[PDB]
Scaffold this motif. Structure first.
Motif: not given
Ligand SMILES: OC[C@H]1O[C@@H](O[C@H]2[C@H](O)[C@@H](O)[C@H](O[C@H]3[C@H](O)[C@@H](O)[C@H](O[C@H]4[C@H](O)[C@@H](O)[C@H](O)O[C@@H]4CO)O[C@@H]3CO)O[C@@H]2CO)[C@H](O)[C@@H](O)[C@@H]1O
Ligand code: NAG
Ligand code: CL
Ligand code: CU
Length: 235
Positions: A61, A110, A117, A120-121, A124-125, A225-229
């Protein structure tokens, strides 16, 4: 305007990587000249002291930031796609060595661009570490902001496609090497004025008609993915 603070591995913060395992530029100014060495790993490409240990199948990430870590990440105006490439550290970014592990332009569902995104994340990606030869690698994360990509830089140097480029030093220890890394594209070189996704009007044209610059994602890629981890605020 944005930069990489460091990386998480399988949701574990590896700590501040700047000038340590990330070949950081002195600031978050964009790269716009397509023919410049700066397209490789940004304005300050040099071996830095550290390389993050990972294995094939790990989740790597990248964490981006604007001014301070976990701030607003990148300006909402910088609509555009996200790509991650890999090269052997051998190459130092030179020659036909960059393999695309990930591409994300526009999500129709979306109705958000990759960059939307990423904000939003919390910046983080991620990509899944592929089954290449154990050894030392650069992972080149690239954000293209298109808020002025209606022009070409070569014709109007105060506009053009903006490239926010960050090379991480990654050491891949354990890997069965079921997917040996092929030859790739050069940077500078793979992006030219005619290449699609470079010149596009996000104000007049719809984002569904957008087509990210090539090359295509290598078949040996295990996605991302594009999202907080993880929570940077808990440190
Ligand atoms: O919005 C549609 C409109 O956008 C126009 O382009 C605007 C951008 O939208 C705007 O976000 C951009 O803002 C830049 C600003 O120019 C930079 O100077 C500034 O740089 C700061 C940096 O942010 C700090 O982090 C750092 O510490 O210092 C530097 C030093 O200046 O960063 C922001 C982004 O964060 O400004 C653009 C103006 O060109 C398009 O021109 C237009 O076509 C669109 O309609
Ligand atoms: C772009 O980069 C090339 C190669 O470094 C350089 O020679 C040229 O001066 C730059 N172009 C512009 C428009 O400044
Ligand atoms: Cl800008
Ligand atoms: Cu900017």
């Amino acid at each position: 305007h944005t930069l990489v603070w460091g990386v998480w591995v399988n949701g574990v913060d590896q700590g501040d990587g700047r000038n340590i395992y990330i070949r950081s530029p002195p600031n978050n100014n964009p790269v716009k000249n397509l023919t410049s060495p700066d397209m490789t790993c940004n304005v300050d490409n040099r071996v830095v002291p550290k390389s993050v240990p990972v294995n094939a199948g790990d989740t790597l990430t990248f964490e981006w930031y604007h001014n301070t870590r976990d701030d607003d990440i990148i300006a909402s105006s910088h609509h555009g796609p996200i790509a991650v490439y890999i090269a052997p550290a051998a190459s130092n970014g030179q020659g036909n060595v960059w393999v695309k592990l990930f591409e994300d332009a526009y999500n129709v569902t979306n109705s958000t661009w990759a960059v939307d995104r990423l904000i939003t994340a919390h910046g983080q990606h991620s990509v899944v570490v592929p089954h290449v030869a154990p050894g030392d690698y650069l992972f080149r994360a690239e954000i293209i902001a298109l808020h002025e990509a209606d022009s070409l830089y070569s014709q109007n140097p105060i506009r053009g496609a903006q490239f926010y480029i960050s090379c991480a030093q990654i050491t891949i220890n354990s890997s069965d090497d079921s997917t040996p890394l092929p030859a790739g594209v050069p940077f500078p070189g793979a992006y030219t004025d005619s290449t699609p996704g470079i010149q596009f009007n996000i104000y007049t044209t719809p984002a569904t008609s957008y087509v990210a610059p090539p090359p295509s994602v290598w078949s040996g890629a295990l996605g991302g993915s594009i999202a907080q981890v993880g929570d940077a605020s808990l440190e």
